[PDB]
Structure 1
Amino acid sequence: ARTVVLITGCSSGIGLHLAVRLASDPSQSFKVYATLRDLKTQGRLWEAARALACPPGSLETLQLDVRDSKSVAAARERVTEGRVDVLVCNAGLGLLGPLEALGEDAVASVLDVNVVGTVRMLQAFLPDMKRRGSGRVLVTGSVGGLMGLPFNDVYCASKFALEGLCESLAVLLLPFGVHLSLIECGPVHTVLGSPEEVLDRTDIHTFHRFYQYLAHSKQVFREAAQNPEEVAEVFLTALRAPKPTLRYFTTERFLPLLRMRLDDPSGSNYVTAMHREVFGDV
Protein backbone atom coordinates (compact mmCIF):
# COMPACT_ATOMS: atom_id res chain seq x y z
CA ALA A 1 0.00 0.00 0.00
CA ARG A 2 0.93 3.65 0.10
CA THR A 3 2.27 4.61 3.61
CA VAL A 4 5.58 2.82 4.15
CA VAL A 5 6.22 1.97 7.79
CA LEU A 6 9.43 0.46 9.14
CA ILE A 7 9.32 -0.87 12.73
CA THR A 8 12.17 -2.23 14.76
CA GLY A 9 11.88 -5.07 17.29
CA CYS A 10 8.83 -6.89 15.98
CA SER A 11 9.47 -10.38 17.36
CA SER A 12 7.10 -9.83 20.28
CA GLY A 13 5.39 -7.23 22.38
CA ILE A 14 4.41 -3.84 21.16
CA GLY A 15 6.36 -4.03 17.92
CA LEU A 16 4.67 -7.30 16.97
CA HIS A 17 1.19 -5.95 17.76
CA LEU A 18 1.79 -2.66 16.03
CA ALA A 19 3.12 -4.32 12.87
CA VAL A 20 0.02 -6.53 12.49
CA ARG A 21 -2.33 -3.75 13.52
CA LEU A 22 -0.97 -1.57 10.67
CA ALA A 23 -0.70 -4.35 8.08
CA SER A 24 -4.26 -5.50 8.77
CA ASP A 25 -5.78 -2.01 8.83
CA PRO A 26 -9.11 -2.09 6.94
CA SER A 27 -7.95 0.84 4.75
CA GLN A 28 -5.05 -1.27 3.39
CA SER A 29 -3.06 1.97 3.32
CA PHE A 30 0.05 0.68 5.09
CA LYS A 31 2.96 -1.34 3.83
CA VAL A 32 4.89 -2.56 6.88
CA TYR A 33 8.51 -3.65 7.07
CA ALA A 34 8.64 -5.47 10.39
CA THR A 35 12.24 -5.88 11.41
CA LEU A 36 13.72 -8.35 13.85
CA ARG A 37 17.20 -8.92 15.23
CA ASP A 38 17.03 -12.65 14.48
CA LEU A 39 14.78 -13.97 11.71
CA LYS A 40 14.37 -17.29 13.55
CA THR A 41 11.97 -15.50 15.91
CA GLN A 42 9.58 -14.37 13.17
CA GLY A 43 7.07 -17.17 13.68
CA ARG A 44 4.87 -15.36 16.18
CA LEU A 45 4.63 -12.35 13.91
CA TRP A 46 3.44 -14.55 10.97
CA GLU A 47 1.00 -16.46 13.11
CA ALA A 48 -0.48 -13.11 14.29
CA ALA A 49 -0.55 -11.77 10.72
CA ARG A 50 -2.43 -14.85 9.56
CA ALA A 51 -4.90 -14.57 12.47
CA LEU A 52 -5.70 -10.98 11.44
CA ALA A 53 -5.74 -11.92 7.78
CA CYS A 54 -3.13 -9.33 6.72
CA PRO A 55 -3.37 -9.09 2.94
CA PRO A 56 -0.43 -10.61 1.02
CA GLY A 57 2.32 -8.05 0.59
CA SER A 58 1.10 -5.76 3.40
CA LEU A 59 3.84 -7.11 5.68
CA GLU A 60 7.46 -8.06 5.03
CA THR A 61 10.08 -9.09 7.55
CA LEU A 62 13.70 -7.92 7.37
CA GLN A 63 16.58 -8.83 9.66
CA LEU A 64 17.90 -5.65 11.29
CA ASP A 65 20.33 -5.62 14.18
CA VAL A 66 20.32 -2.05 15.58
CA ARG A 67 23.72 -2.70 17.15
CA ASP A 68 25.19 -2.77 13.63
CA SER A 69 25.16 0.17 11.23
CA LYS A 70 25.87 -2.17 8.30
CA SER A 71 22.73 -4.10 9.18
CA VAL A 72 20.83 -0.78 9.43
CA ALA A 73 22.18 0.28 6.02
CA ALA A 74 21.29 -3.09 4.45
CA ALA A 75 17.69 -3.04 5.74
CA ARG A 76 17.25 0.50 4.38
CA GLU A 77 18.32 -0.79 0.95
CA ARG A 78 15.63 -3.52 1.14
CA VAL A 79 12.84 -0.87 1.28
CA THR A 80 11.78 -1.24 -2.33
CA GLU A 81 9.60 1.90 -2.29
CA GLY A 82 12.81 3.85 -1.74
CA ARG A 83 11.24 5.82 1.09
CA VAL A 84 10.00 5.37 4.66
CA ASP A 85 7.02 7.47 5.64
CA VAL A 86 6.83 6.34 9.25
CA LEU A 87 9.82 5.05 11.20
CA VAL A 88 9.00 3.36 14.50
CA CYS A 89 11.99 3.06 16.80
CA ASN A 90 10.79 0.35 19.15
CA ALA A 91 13.67 -2.09 19.63
CA GLY A 92 14.43 -2.13 23.35
CA LEU A 93 16.02 -4.17 26.13
CA GLY A 94 15.30 -4.18 29.83
CA LEU A 95 17.69 -4.75 32.70
CA LEU A 96 16.54 -5.32 36.26
CA GLY A 97 18.61 -5.82 39.38
CA PRO A 98 20.91 -4.12 41.91
CA LEU A 99 23.35 -1.98 39.94
CA GLU A 100 26.44 -3.74 41.36
CA ALA A 101 25.04 -7.13 40.27
CA LEU A 102 24.80 -6.16 36.58
CA GLY A 103 27.49 -7.25 34.19
CA GLU A 104 29.31 -4.43 32.43
CA ASP A 105 28.52 -6.08 29.08
CA ALA A 106 24.81 -6.20 29.88
CA VAL A 107 24.89 -2.53 30.86
CA ALA A 108 26.70 -1.57 27.63
CA SER A 109 24.28 -3.70 25.58
CA VAL A 110 21.21 -1.98 26.97
CA LEU A 111 22.61 1.41 26.07
CA ASP A 112 23.88 0.26 22.69
CA VAL A 113 20.54 -1.21 21.68
CA ASN A 114 18.18 1.30 23.32
CA VAL A 115 20.08 4.48 22.75
CA VAL A 116 22.83 4.06 20.16
CA GLY A 117 20.61 1.78 18.07
CA THR A 118 17.97 4.51 17.92
CA VAL A 119 20.68 7.01 16.94
CA ARG A 120 21.82 4.62 14.14
CA MET A 121 18.25 4.42 12.82
CA LEU A 122 17.80 8.20 12.87
CA GLN A 123 21.14 8.79 11.18
CA ALA A 124 20.17 6.36 8.44
CA PHE A 125 16.61 7.55 7.86
CA LEU A 126 16.33 11.13 8.99
CA PRO A 127 18.32 12.73 6.12
CA ASP A 128 15.84 11.47 3.53
CA MET A 129 12.89 12.74 5.50
CA LYS A 130 14.51 16.15 5.93
CA ARG A 131 15.10 16.30 2.15
CA ARG A 132 11.49 15.40 1.33
CA GLY A 133 10.14 17.72 3.98
CA SER A 134 7.99 14.94 5.45
CA GLY A 135 8.14 11.89 7.65
CA ARG A 136 6.98 10.67 11.03
CA VAL A 137 9.19 9.09 13.64
CA LEU A 138 7.57 7.36 16.60
CA VAL A 139 9.76 6.20 19.46
CA THR A 140 8.61 3.75 22.12
CA GLY A 141 9.07 5.52 25.42
CA SER A 142 8.28 4.49 28.96
CA VAL A 143 7.13 6.11 32.15
CA GLY A 144 10.61 4.86 33.26
CA GLY A 145 12.06 7.52 30.96
CA LEU A 146 10.15 10.15 32.97
CA MET A 147 10.91 9.08 36.54
CA GLY A 148 13.54 6.88 38.15
CA LEU A 149 12.53 3.41 39.41
CA PRO A 150 14.63 1.45 41.91
CA PHE A 151 16.46 -1.54 40.46
CA ASN A 152 15.84 -0.23 36.93
CA ASP A 153 18.77 2.19 37.01
CA VAL A 154 20.20 1.26 33.60
CA TYR A 155 16.83 0.75 31.93
CA CYS A 156 15.68 4.19 33.21
CA ALA A 157 19.04 5.65 32.16
CA SER A 158 18.37 4.39 28.63
CA LYS A 159 14.73 5.62 28.49
CA PHE A 160 15.66 9.04 29.95
CA ALA A 161 18.38 9.16 27.28
CA LEU A 162 15.71 8.77 24.59
CA GLU A 163 13.76 11.66 26.10
CA GLY A 164 16.80 13.93 25.83
CA LEU A 165 17.66 12.72 22.35
CA CYS A 166 14.16 13.14 20.97
CA GLU A 167 13.46 16.47 22.64
CA SER A 168 16.71 17.91 21.27
CA LEU A 169 15.85 16.69 17.78
CA ALA A 170 12.26 17.91 17.97
CA VAL A 171 13.38 21.52 18.58
CA LEU A 172 15.44 21.40 15.37
CA LEU A 173 12.90 19.42 13.26
CA LEU A 174 9.98 21.81 13.73
CA PRO A 175 10.65 23.70 10.45
CA PHE A 176 11.52 20.57 8.41
CA GLY A 177 8.05 19.08 8.48
CA VAL A 178 9.45 15.89 10.08
CA HIS A 179 7.50 14.89 13.18
CA LEU A 180 8.97 13.03 16.10
CA SER A 181 6.87 11.62 18.95
CA LEU A 182 7.55 9.47 21.99
CA ILE A 183 4.76 7.08 22.97
CA GLU A 184 5.07 6.88 26.75
CA CYS A 185 4.01 3.42 27.87
CA GLY A 186 3.22 2.21 31.35
CA PRO A 187 3.21 -1.59 31.98
CA VAL A 188 1.81 -3.57 29.05
CA HIS A 189 0.68 -7.18 28.99
CA THR A 190 3.42 -9.03 27.05
CA VAL A 191 14.44 -10.00 32.25
CA LEU A 192 15.71 -11.02 35.78
CA GLY A 193 18.41 -13.27 37.26
CA SER A 194 18.64 -16.26 39.63
CA PRO A 195 18.13 -15.26 43.32
CA GLU A 196 21.36 -17.15 44.00
CA GLU A 197 23.26 -15.13 41.38
CA VAL A 198 21.86 -11.82 42.60
CA LEU A 199 22.60 -12.60 46.26
CA ASP A 200 26.11 -13.59 45.29
CA ARG A 201 26.70 -10.13 43.80
CA THR A 202 25.05 -7.84 46.33
CA ASP A 203 24.47 -7.54 50.07
CA ILE A 204 21.64 -9.17 52.01
CA HIS A 205 19.88 -5.80 52.65
CA THR A 206 19.86 -4.83 48.95
CA PHE A 207 18.68 -8.34 48.14
CA HIS A 208 15.86 -7.93 50.61
CA ARG A 209 14.82 -4.61 49.06
CA PHE A 210 14.96 -6.30 45.63
CA TYR A 211 12.40 -8.82 46.84
CA GLN A 212 10.16 -6.03 48.10
CA TYR A 213 10.46 -4.25 44.77
CA LEU A 214 9.56 -7.44 42.84
CA ALA A 215 6.53 -7.93 45.01
CA HIS A 216 5.48 -4.33 44.46
CA SER A 217 5.97 -4.37 40.68
CA LYS A 218 3.99 -7.59 40.40
CA GLN A 219 1.07 -5.78 42.01
CA VAL A 220 1.41 -2.67 39.83
CA PHE A 221 1.42 -4.88 36.76
CA ARG A 222 -1.73 -6.75 37.87
CA GLU A 223 -3.60 -3.49 38.43
CA ALA A 224 -2.21 -1.31 35.72
CA ALA A 225 -0.94 -3.31 32.78
CA GLN A 226 -2.70 -2.35 29.57
CA ASN A 227 -3.69 -4.61 26.70
CA PRO A 228 -1.21 -4.32 23.79
CA GLU A 229 -4.18 -3.42 21.52
CA GLU A 230 -4.90 -0.32 23.53
CA VAL A 231 -1.21 0.70 23.49
CA ALA A 232 -0.74 0.01 19.77
CA GLU A 233 -3.73 2.24 19.04
CA VAL A 234 -1.96 5.16 20.71
CA PHE A 235 0.78 4.84 18.07
CA LEU A 236 -1.91 5.08 15.40
CA THR A 237 -3.48 8.11 17.01
CA ALA A 238 -0.04 9.78 16.95
CA LEU A 239 0.65 8.82 13.35
CA ARG A 240 -2.67 10.23 12.18
CA ALA A 241 -2.46 13.52 14.16
CA PRO A 242 -2.06 16.35 11.64
CA LYS A 243 0.21 18.14 14.12
CA PRO A 244 1.63 15.50 16.49
CA THR A 245 2.85 16.51 19.94
CA LEU A 246 6.25 15.42 21.27
CA ARG A 247 4.73 12.96 23.75
CA TYR A 248 1.66 10.77 23.87
CA PHE A 249 0.79 8.93 27.07
CA THR A 250 -0.86 5.54 26.90
CA THR A 251 -2.23 6.09 30.39
CA GLU A 252 -2.70 9.06 32.73
CA ARG A 253 -2.29 6.93 35.86
CA PHE A 254 1.27 8.13 36.58
CA LEU A 255 0.75 11.78 35.72
CA PRO A 256 0.42 12.74 39.43
CA LEU A 257 3.73 11.16 40.42
CA LEU A 258 5.15 12.88 37.38
CA ARG A 259 3.72 16.21 38.57
CA MET A 260 5.06 15.80 42.10
CA ARG A 261 8.38 15.00 40.50
CA LEU A 262 8.04 18.14 38.36
CA ASP A 263 6.90 20.41 41.25
CA ASP A 264 9.91 19.71 43.47
CA PRO A 265 13.03 20.17 41.28
CA SER A 266 15.30 19.27 44.18
CA GLY A 267 13.86 15.76 43.77
CA SER A 268 13.39 15.05 47.49
CA ASN A 269 9.56 14.82 47.42
CA TYR A 270 9.73 12.35 44.58
CA VAL A 271 12.48 10.23 46.11
CA THR A 272 10.66 10.06 49.43
CA ALA A 273 7.23 9.38 47.86
CA MET A 274 8.62 6.67 45.60
CA HIS A 275 10.56 5.09 48.42
CA ARG A 276 7.47 4.80 50.64
CA GLU A 277 5.42 3.67 47.62
CA VAL A 278 7.73 0.73 46.81
CA PHE A 279 9.20 -0.25 50.19
CA GLY A 280 7.54 1.65 53.04
CA ASP A 281 8.85 4.06 55.68
CA VAL A 282 12.60 4.75 56.19
Structure 2
Amino acid sequence: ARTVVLITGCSSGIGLHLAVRLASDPSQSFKVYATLRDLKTQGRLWEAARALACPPGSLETLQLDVRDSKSVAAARERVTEGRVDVLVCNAGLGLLGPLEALGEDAVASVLDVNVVGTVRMLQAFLPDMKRRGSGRVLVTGSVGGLMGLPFNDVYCASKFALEGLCESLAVLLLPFGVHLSLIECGPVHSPEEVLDRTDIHTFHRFYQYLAHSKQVFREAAQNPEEVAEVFLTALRAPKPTLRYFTTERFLPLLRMRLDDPSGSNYVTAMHREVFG
Protein backbone atom coordinates (compact mmCIF):
# COMPACT_ATOMS: atom_id res chain seq x y z
CA ALA A 1 0.00 0.00 0.00
CA ARG A 2 2.93 2.12 1.18
CA THR A 3 6.11 2.46 -0.96
CA VAL A 4 8.83 0.00 0.39
CA VAL A 5 12.35 1.37 0.29
CA LEU A 6 15.43 -0.61 1.30
CA ILE A 7 18.70 1.32 1.88
CA THR A 8 22.21 0.27 2.68
CA GLY A 9 24.91 2.16 4.73
CA CYS A 10 22.51 3.85 7.19
CA SER A 11 24.75 4.41 10.29
CA SER A 12 25.63 7.92 9.17
CA GLY A 13 25.71 10.36 6.37
CA ILE A 14 23.70 10.12 3.20
CA GLY A 15 21.96 6.81 4.06
CA LEU A 16 21.05 7.99 7.58
CA HIS A 17 19.69 11.37 6.48
CA LEU A 18 17.85 9.84 3.65
CA ALA A 19 16.39 7.01 5.75
CA VAL A 20 14.81 9.40 8.24
CA ARG A 21 13.91 11.77 5.49
CA LEU A 22 11.80 9.04 3.88
CA ALA A 23 10.34 7.67 7.17
CA SER A 24 9.15 11.07 8.38
CA ASP A 25 7.75 11.98 5.04
CA PRO A 26 4.48 13.93 5.99
CA SER A 27 2.29 12.07 3.47
CA GLN A 28 3.47 8.86 5.34
CA SER A 29 3.96 7.17 1.98
CA PHE A 30 7.25 5.13 2.62
CA LYS A 31 8.31 2.07 4.53
CA VAL A 32 12.02 2.18 5.24
CA TYR A 33 14.36 -0.71 5.89
CA ALA A 34 17.47 1.08 6.98
CA THR A 35 20.42 -1.35 6.75
CA LEU A 36 23.83 -0.98 8.55
CA ARG A 37 27.02 -3.26 8.54
CA ASP A 38 26.61 -3.60 12.42
CA LEU A 39 23.45 -2.95 14.43
CA LYS A 40 25.62 -1.43 17.23
CA THR A 41 26.21 1.71 15.21
CA GLN A 42 22.36 2.36 14.90
CA GLY A 43 22.45 5.03 17.67
CA ARG A 44 22.46 8.05 15.32
CA LEU A 45 19.84 6.63 13.00
CA TRP A 46 17.35 6.38 15.97
CA GLU A 47 18.23 9.55 17.73
CA ALA A 48 17.56 11.27 14.38
CA ALA A 49 14.39 9.23 13.80
CA ARG A 50 13.01 10.55 17.12
CA ALA A 51 13.93 14.13 16.21
CA LEU A 52 11.99 14.11 12.97
CA ALA A 53 9.19 12.17 14.69
CA CYS A 54 9.06 9.19 12.31
CA PRO A 55 5.73 7.42 13.15
CA PRO A 56 6.14 3.86 14.65
CA GLY A 57 6.77 1.33 11.94
CA SER A 58 7.82 3.78 9.22
CA LEU A 59 11.36 2.70 10.09
CA GLU A 60 13.08 -0.65 10.65
CA THR A 61 16.76 -1.53 10.98
CA LEU A 62 18.33 -4.65 9.64
CA GLN A 63 21.94 -5.92 9.73
CA LEU A 64 23.20 -6.05 6.16
CA ASP A 65 26.87 -6.62 5.46
CA VAL A 66 27.24 -6.27 1.69
CA ARG A 67 30.58 -8.11 1.78
CA ASP A 68 28.48 -11.23 2.34
CA SER A 69 25.61 -12.37 0.32
CA LYS A 70 24.11 -14.59 3.12
CA SER A 71 23.55 -11.30 5.03
CA VAL A 72 22.04 -9.98 1.76
CA ALA A 73 19.55 -12.95 1.44
CA ALA A 74 18.77 -12.73 5.27
CA ALA A 75 17.66 -9.21 4.81
CA ARG A 76 15.73 -9.51 1.57
CA GLU A 77 14.16 -12.25 3.65
CA ARG A 78 13.17 -9.83 6.61
CA VAL A 79 11.16 -7.76 4.08
CA THR A 80 7.69 -8.43 5.62
CA GLU A 81 5.96 -6.83 2.58
CA GLY A 82 7.64 -9.40 0.34
CA ARG A 83 8.72 -6.68 -2.13
CA VAL A 84 11.03 -3.72 -2.49
CA ASP A 85 9.81 -0.80 -4.52
CA VAL A 86 12.88 1.31 -4.09
CA LEU A 87 16.38 0.01 -3.51
CA VAL A 88 19.10 2.45 -2.64
CA CYS A 89 22.64 1.15 -2.83
CA ASN A 90 24.36 3.61 -0.66
CA ALA A 91 27.09 1.56 1.20
CA GLY A 92 30.59 2.99 0.39
CA LEU A 93 34.15 3.04 1.82
CA GLY A 94 36.59 5.72 0.86
CA LEU A 95 40.37 5.32 0.91
CA LEU A 96 42.76 8.24 0.78
CA GLY A 97 46.44 7.93 0.14
CA PRO A 98 49.56 7.42 -1.84
CA LEU A 99 48.87 4.19 -3.72
CA GLU A 100 52.06 2.47 -2.47
CA ALA A 101 50.97 3.30 1.07
CA LEU A 102 47.64 1.39 0.87
CA GLY A 103 47.39 -2.11 2.18
CA GLU A 104 46.46 -4.73 -0.34
CA ASP A 105 43.64 -5.60 2.06
CA ALA A 106 42.10 -2.21 2.25
CA VAL A 107 42.28 -1.91 -1.53
CA ALA A 108 40.45 -5.28 -1.80
CA SER A 109 37.82 -4.22 0.74
CA VAL A 110 36.91 -0.97 -0.89
CA LEU A 111 36.24 -2.75 -4.18
CA ASP A 112 34.45 -5.62 -2.37
CA VAL A 113 32.12 -3.35 -0.53
CA ASN A 114 31.59 -0.60 -3.11
CA VAL A 115 31.53 -2.54 -6.38
CA VAL A 116 30.97 -6.21 -5.47
CA GLY A 117 28.62 -5.19 -2.62
CA THR A 118 26.48 -3.42 -5.08
CA VAL A 119 26.65 -6.33 -7.48
CA ARG A 120 25.33 -8.68 -4.70
CA MET A 121 22.41 -6.33 -3.87
CA LEU A 122 21.20 -6.15 -7.48
CA GLN A 123 21.53 -9.89 -8.06
CA ALA A 124 19.43 -10.37 -4.92
CA PHE A 125 16.87 -7.64 -5.72
CA LEU A 126 16.85 -7.20 -9.43
CA PRO A 127 15.21 -10.40 -10.55
CA ASP A 128 12.12 -9.76 -8.45
CA MET A 129 11.59 -6.19 -9.85
CA LYS A 130 12.23 -7.48 -13.38
CA ARG A 131 9.39 -10.03 -13.31
CA ARG A 132 7.05 -7.48 -11.77
CA GLY A 133 8.09 -4.83 -14.36
CA SER A 134 8.37 -2.13 -11.68
CA GLY A 135 11.17 -1.09 -9.38
CA ARG A 136 13.36 1.92 -8.62
CA VAL A 137 17.16 1.31 -8.01
CA LEU A 138 19.23 4.40 -6.83
CA VAL A 139 22.97 4.29 -6.40
CA THR A 140 24.95 6.87 -4.56
CA GLY A 141 27.59 7.98 -7.14
CA SER A 142 30.34 10.58 -6.82
CA VAL A 143 32.30 13.10 -8.69
CA GLY A 144 35.25 10.72 -8.05
CA GLY A 145 33.36 8.31 -10.24
CA LEU A 146 33.22 10.91 -13.02
CA MET A 147 36.84 12.14 -12.97
CA GLY A 148 40.07 10.92 -11.41
CA LEU A 149 41.12 12.59 -8.08
CA PRO A 150 44.79 12.36 -7.01
CA PHE A 151 45.32 10.25 -4.00
CA ASN A 152 41.84 8.72 -4.34
CA ASP A 153 42.91 6.15 -6.96
CA VAL A 154 41.07 3.15 -5.56
CA TYR A 155 38.14 5.21 -4.35
CA CYS A 156 37.86 6.50 -7.95
CA ALA A 157 38.53 3.10 -9.33
CA SER A 158 35.45 1.81 -7.37
CA LYS A 159 33.28 4.91 -8.22
CA PHE A 160 34.01 4.57 -12.03
CA ALA A 161 33.19 0.84 -11.53
CA LEU A 162 29.70 1.90 -10.56
CA GLU A 163 29.24 4.24 -13.48
CA GLY A 164 30.05 1.34 -15.87
CA LEU A 165 28.17 -1.19 -13.95
CA CYS A 166 25.04 0.99 -13.83
CA GLU A 167 25.41 2.23 -17.38
CA SER A 168 25.60 -1.35 -18.70
CA LEU A 169 22.59 -2.43 -16.69
CA ALA A 170 20.46 0.56 -17.61
CA VAL A 171 20.85 -0.14 -21.39
CA LEU A 172 19.44 -3.58 -20.63
CA LEU A 173 16.71 -2.37 -18.22
CA LEU A 174 15.25 0.33 -20.51
CA PRO A 175 12.01 -1.43 -21.57
CA PHE A 176 11.71 -3.64 -18.42
CA GLY A 177 10.05 -0.78 -16.57
CA VAL A 178 12.89 -1.12 -13.96
CA HIS A 179 14.61 2.28 -13.35
CA LEU A 180 18.24 2.77 -12.34
CA SER A 181 19.84 6.03 -11.40
CA LEU A 182 23.17 7.18 -10.14
CA ILE A 183 23.00 10.22 -7.76
CA GLU A 184 26.25 12.07 -8.16
CA CYS A 185 27.42 13.96 -5.17
CA GLY A 186 30.46 16.30 -4.78
CA PRO A 187 31.53 16.84 -1.17
CA VAL A 188 28.91 16.58 1.67
CA HIS A 189 29.03 17.71 5.44
CA SER A 190 48.79 9.15 11.09
CA PRO A 191 51.38 11.03 8.95
CA GLU A 192 54.42 9.03 10.27
CA GLU A 193 53.16 5.81 8.82
CA VAL A 194 52.17 7.24 5.46
CA LEU A 195 55.77 8.60 5.51
CA ASP A 196 57.01 5.00 6.16
CA ARG A 197 55.09 3.65 3.18
CA THR A 198 56.41 6.30 0.58
CA ASP A 199 58.94 9.00 -0.61
CA ILE A 200 59.21 12.56 0.64
CA HIS A 201 57.96 14.33 -2.58
CA THR A 202 54.71 12.33 -2.66
CA PHE A 203 54.06 12.90 1.01
CA HIS A 204 54.68 16.62 0.48
CA ARG A 205 52.11 16.36 -2.36
CA PHE A 206 49.69 14.52 -0.17
CA TYR A 207 49.97 17.40 2.34
CA GLN A 208 49.44 19.92 -0.46
CA TYR A 209 46.43 17.82 -1.61
CA LEU A 210 44.75 17.74 1.83
CA ALA A 211 45.22 21.36 2.49
CA HIS A 212 43.54 22.01 -0.92
CA SER A 213 40.68 19.75 -0.39
CA LYS A 214 40.11 21.12 3.20
CA GLN A 215 39.31 24.33 1.38
CA VAL A 216 36.93 22.96 -1.14
CA PHE A 217 35.19 21.00 1.62
CA ARG A 218 34.60 24.18 3.79
CA GLU A 219 33.59 26.15 0.71
CA ALA A 220 31.62 23.55 -1.19
CA ALA A 221 30.36 20.73 1.11
CA GLN A 222 26.54 20.35 0.83
CA ASN A 223 23.94 19.53 3.57
CA PRO A 224 23.05 15.82 3.27
CA GLU A 225 19.49 17.18 3.52
CA GLU A 226 20.14 18.98 0.23
CA VAL A 227 21.74 15.72 -1.11
CA ALA A 228 18.99 13.40 0.33
CA GLU A 229 16.31 15.44 -1.37
CA VAL A 230 17.90 14.74 -4.77
CA PHE A 231 17.15 11.03 -4.32
CA LEU A 232 13.35 11.82 -3.96
CA THR A 233 13.47 14.01 -6.96
CA ALA A 234 14.71 10.84 -8.75
CA LEU A 235 12.41 8.36 -7.03
CA ARG A 236 9.27 10.46 -7.89
CA ALA A 237 10.28 11.38 -11.51
CA PRO A 238 7.72 9.76 -13.94
CA LYS A 239 10.66 9.10 -16.39
CA PRO A 240 14.05 9.14 -14.52
CA THR A 241 17.38 9.75 -16.17
CA LEU A 242 20.33 7.52 -15.51
CA ARG A 243 22.05 10.34 -13.79
CA TYR A 244 21.35 13.11 -11.20
CA PHE A 245 23.90 15.73 -10.04
CA THR A 246 23.66 17.09 -6.57
CA THR A 247 25.60 20.20 -7.73
CA GLU A 248 26.65 21.93 -10.97
CA ARG A 249 29.95 23.05 -9.46
CA PHE A 250 32.05 20.37 -11.04
CA LEU A 251 30.24 20.44 -14.39
CA PRO A 252 32.78 22.89 -16.04
CA LEU A 253 35.65 20.52 -15.00
CA LEU A 254 33.77 17.40 -16.26
CA ARG A 255 33.24 19.10 -19.67
CA MET A 256 36.94 19.73 -20.21
CA ARG A 257 37.43 15.95 -19.60
CA LEU A 258 34.62 15.22 -22.01
CA ASP A 259 36.02 17.41 -24.84
CA ASP A 260 39.55 16.14 -24.63
CA PRO A 261 39.22 12.36 -24.99
CA SER A 262 43.05 11.96 -24.77
CA GLY A 263 42.42 12.75 -21.07
CA SER A 264 45.32 15.16 -20.96
CA ASN A 265 43.65 18.65 -20.75
CA TYR A 266 41.80 17.26 -17.78
CA VAL A 267 45.04 16.01 -16.39
CA THR A 268 46.44 19.55 -16.64
CA ALA A 269 43.47 21.33 -15.18
CA MET A 270 43.16 18.98 -12.19
CA HIS A 271 46.91 19.19 -11.61
CA ARG A 272 46.91 23.09 -11.41
CA GLU A 273 43.64 22.89 -9.43
CA VAL A 274 45.29 20.87 -6.56
CA PHE A 275 49.01 21.65 -6.65
CA GLY A 276 48.37 25.30 -7.57
Instruction: Classify the TM-score, shorter chain.
Output: over 0.9
Shift of 1:94: 0.2
The residue aligned with 2:73 is: 73
Shift of 1:99: 0.2
**What is the rounded CA distance, in whole Å, between the counterparts of 2:270 and 2:58 in structure 1?**
45
**What is the rounded CA distance, in whole Å, between the counterparts of 2:219 and 2:51 in structure 1?**
28
Give percent identity, aligned residues only.
100
Shift of 1:105: 0.3
The residue aligned with 1:222 is: 218
**What is the rounded CA distance, in whole Å, between the counterparts of 1:116 and 1:196 in structure 2?**
32
Shift of 1:19: 0.1
**What is the rounded CA distance, in whole Å, between the counterparts of 1:32 and 1:123 in structure 2?**
20
**What is the rounded CA distance, in whole Å, between the counterparts of 1:202 and 1:249 in structure 2?**
35
RMSD over equivalenced CA pairs, Å: 0.5
**What is the rounded CA distance, in whole Å, between the counterparts of 2:227 and 2:269 in structure 1?**
27
Shift of 1:156: 0.3
Q: How many residues align?
A: 276
Partner-residue secondary structure (3-state), 1:248? strand
Deviations 1:89-125 (A, max 9, x none): 0000000000000000000000000000000000000
Deviations 1:139-173 (A, max 9, x none): 00000000000000000000000000000000000
Where does 1:20-169 land on structure 2 (aligned, <5 Å)?
Answer: 20-169=20-169
Report whether the alignment pairs 1:232 with 2:220: no
Shift of 1:213: 0.2
Shift of 1:238: 0.3
Shift of 1:180: 0.1
Partner-residue secondary structure (3-state), 1:168? helix
**What is the rounded CA distance, in whole Å, between the counterparts of 2:213 and 2:137 in structure 1?**
30
Shift of 1:181: 0.2
**What is the rounded CA distance, in whole Å, between the counterparts of 1:91 and 1:219 in structure 2?**
26
**What is the rounded CA distance, in whole Å, between the counterparts of 1:51 and 1:220 in structure 2?**
30
Partner-residue secondary structure (3-state), 1:175? helix
**What is the rounded CA distance, in whole Å, between the counterparts of 2:43 and 2:268 in structure 1?**
45
Partner-residue secondary structure (3-state), 1:214? helix
**What is the rounded CA distance, in whole Å, between the counterparts of 2:172 and 2:46 in structure 1?**
38
Shift of 1:273: 0.7
Partner-residue secondary structure (3-state), 1:32? strand
Deviations 1:70-100 (A, max 9, x none): 0000000000000000000000000000000
Partner-residue secondary structure (3-state), 1:262? helix
Q: Normalised by the size of structure 1, how large is the TM-score?
A: 0.97
**What is the rounded CA distance, in whole Å, between the counterparts of 2:152 and 2:65 in structure 1?**
24
Deviations 1:184-237 (A, max 9, x none): 000000xxxx10000000000000000000000000001100011100000010
**What is the rounded CA distance, in whole Å, between the counterparts of 2:185 and 2:268 in structure 1?**
24
**What is the rounded CA distance, in whole Å, between the counterparts of 2:48 and 2:157 in structure 1?**
32
Shift of 1:34: 0.1
Q: Normalised by the size of structure 2, how large is the TM-score?
A: 1.00
**What is the rounded CA distance, in whole Å, between the counterparts of 1:273 and 1:16 in structure 2?**
35
Shift of 1:48: 0.2
**What is the rounded CA distance, in whole Å, between the counterparts of 1:229 and 1:36 in structure 2?**
19
